[PDB]
């Protein structure tokens, strides 16, 4: 019929599905752009909270 | 409406006691066969005379053949036609090799440019324009300049099979 | 030599049909290199064999054949209609077929 009062949807559709991850180790979806001028190094690091 | 022939059709009102020998009127008619041609005849007579076919007779019907079928000719053509919202006179020039060929392209043209079907047209006159320079429409004049020549760029060969092994060339 | 072919390659295409109704009794055949009905007139009457394989041996063979004849031409592009001893199976639309050279008239 049409809401009545407008209000923003609850929660973000960009974080779906809200299932359990496929593993404890979250994946690195993306690394920094490469600049081959600089010395070789890692671009990330493992640790424990 | 088809591939035209041209007919002389001659008719008259039926004779009577007090009037034997009625007058005799002829029309040149462009139609694809003599049945359509005798019909067209009565159509037009009934727009000119007190007659109908029920009280008249066709006296003669005779196909007229082009006099010089392989001489190229510039035709003046006069037409009356009906549009969706009114009726109208027109002059077109056609260049072909026989009145018959000329009339076939006219009806084509009238159909394509003006959406006039065959029912809606009246050839008023078709006549060979004798001297050039009484040729009036440019799309024809174009073709009577001295020593005329022209290429046909972008040649398109028809394939005979679905696959080719070359890559065509439109040269010519 | 290397070739032994005594038939013309061909293809089972459709049954004779409407938009919405087919008729298994007549099969439609495309013949290699026949482009027109005039070309196809040559093959009218020639005999067709659909040759297939099977697991059970029969009269000492694992190869079987459905036999037929070309009967008339079809449309404008040298396709041909044919009838068979038994109507062709229809899993074979798009299967190969053999058009012999007999009965011969040359």
């Amino acid at each position: 019929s049409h809401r009545k009062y407008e209000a923003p949807r609850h929660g973000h559709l960009g974080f779906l599905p809200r299932k359990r991850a496929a593993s404890i180790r979250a994946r690195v979806k993306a690394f920094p752009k490469d600049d081959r001028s600089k010395p070789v190094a890692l671009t990330s690091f493992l640790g424990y909270k | 409406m088809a591939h035209f022939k041209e007919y002389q059709v001659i008719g008259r009102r039926l004779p009577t006691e007090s009037v034997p020998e009625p007058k005799l009127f002829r029309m040149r008619i462009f139609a694809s066969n003599e049945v359509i041609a005798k019909s067209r005849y009565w159509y037009f007579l009934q727009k000119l005379h007190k007659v109908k076919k029920a009280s008249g007779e066709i006296v003669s019907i005779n196909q007229i053949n082009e006099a010089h079928p392989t001489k190229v000719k510039n035709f003046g053509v006069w037409v009356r036609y009906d549009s969706r919202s009114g009726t109208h006179n027109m002059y077109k020039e056609i260049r072909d090799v026989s009145r018959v060929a000329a009339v076939e392209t006219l009806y084509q043209d009238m159909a394509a440019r003006h959406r006039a079907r065959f029912r809606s047209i009246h050839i008023l006159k078709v006549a060979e324009i004798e001297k050039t320079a009484d040729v009036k429409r440019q799309y024809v004049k174009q073709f009577l300049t001295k020593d005329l020549k022209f290429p046909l760029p972008h040649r398109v060969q028809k394939s005979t099979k679905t696959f080719s092994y070359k890559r065509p060339s439109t040269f010519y | 030599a290397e070739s032994h072919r005594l038939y013309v390659k061909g293809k089972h295409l459709s049954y004779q049909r409407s938009k919405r109704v087919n008729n298994p009794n007549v099969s439609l055949i495309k013949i290699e290199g026949v482009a027109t009905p005039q070309d196809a007139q040559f093959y009218l009457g020639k005999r067709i064999a659909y040759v297939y394989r099977a697991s059970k041996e029969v009269r000492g063979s694992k190869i079987r054949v459905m036999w037929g004849k070309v009967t008339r031409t079809h449309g404008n592009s040298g396709v041909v209609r044919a009838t068979f001893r038994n109507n062709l199976p229809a899993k074979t639309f798009g299967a190969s077929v053999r058009i012999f050279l007999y009965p011969s008239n040359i």
């Binding site: - | 679905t162 080719s164 092994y165 439109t170 | 295409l13 798009g94």
Partner: protein
């Protein structure tokens, strides 16, 4: 005619390439199409872009996952035009489609296997000269396709190797022609002339 026919997509018109490919399949002719990124659609780029976003809005309202799928790749655009011309929910149709393979660029096997064209769908032979048209590769990249650059790069690499292959071959048939030459004007040669060879 041949067991597998490789079509060089470049310079062809999508729906006319599609219409003939579907047919060949249905009649049992295996087909592989290459360089689908160099495919054409008539009508200028903007129109076909607009047309594609029309496509993009269609989706299953309760679940966009079950709704129409929008493949961005120039080969998959192409497959769509094809699949649309094949009774593809029948077993016969599935069968037909397995006879088909469509690619961007010319990847192995096919880079050394000859490719043919289909004149009745050749853009340069069909479109009135002057009319605007659209390259599939460019249409795709603008709706999401990710790999124009890496096709372009691979192709350019591939094109180097094939100009060598070619150069060699053209050099080998200059000799071969310098053969058919001594042999010319000889008895066996004019005898073969006589019979049209």
């Amino acid at each position: 005619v041949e067991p597998v026919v490789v079509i060089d997509g470049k310079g062809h018109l999508v729906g006319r390439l599609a219409s003939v490919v579907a047919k060949q399949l249905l009649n049992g002719q295996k087909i592989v199409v290459v360089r689908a990124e160099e495919l054409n659609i008539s009508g200028e780029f903007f129109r076909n872009k607009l047309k594609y976003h029309d496509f993009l809005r269609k989706a299953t309202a309760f679940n966009k996952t079950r709704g129409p799928f929008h493949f961005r790749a120039p080969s998959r655009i192409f497959y769509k035009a094809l699949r649309g011309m094949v009774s593809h929910k029948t077993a016969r149709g599935k069968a037909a489609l397995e006879r088909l393979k469509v690619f961007e660029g010319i990847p192995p096997p096919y880079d050394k296997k000859k490719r043919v064209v289909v004149p009745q769908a050749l853009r340069v032979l069909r479109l009135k000269p002057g009319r605007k048209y659209t390259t599939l590769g460019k249409l795709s990249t603008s709706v999401g396709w990710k790999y124009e650059d890496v096709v372009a790069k691979l192709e350019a690499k591939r094109k180097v190797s094939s100009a060598e292959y070619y150069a060699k071959k053209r050099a080998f048939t200059k000799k071969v022609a310098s053969a058919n030459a001594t042999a010319a004007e000889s008895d066996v040669a004019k005898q073969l002339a006589a019979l049209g060879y």
